[PDB]
Amino acid sequence: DAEFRHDSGYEVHHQKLVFFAEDVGSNKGAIIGLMVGGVVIA
């Protein structure tokens, strides 16, 4: 939460592209077989 983001070097400009790629994967509506088909059960 805070510790992970307590990097003076690891938590800086170094990350200016990954701050978006970690979400686009959740297209929804087009990944029912890739993000549910044989994965989610509940």
Side-chain angles (χ1 to χ4, degrees), residues 5-41:
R5 273 60 150 80
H6 215 150
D7 261 316
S8 351
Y10 225 115
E11 209 289 281
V12 223
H13 135 95
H14 216 331
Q15 313 156 128
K16 190 166 114 266
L17 45 148
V18 70
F19 206 74
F20 230 120
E22 213 55 23
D23 172 52
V24 182
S26 319
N27 197 354
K28 231 281 166 257
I31 334 197
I32 176 57
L34 247 151
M35 219 220 301
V36 146
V39 183
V40 179
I41 302 104

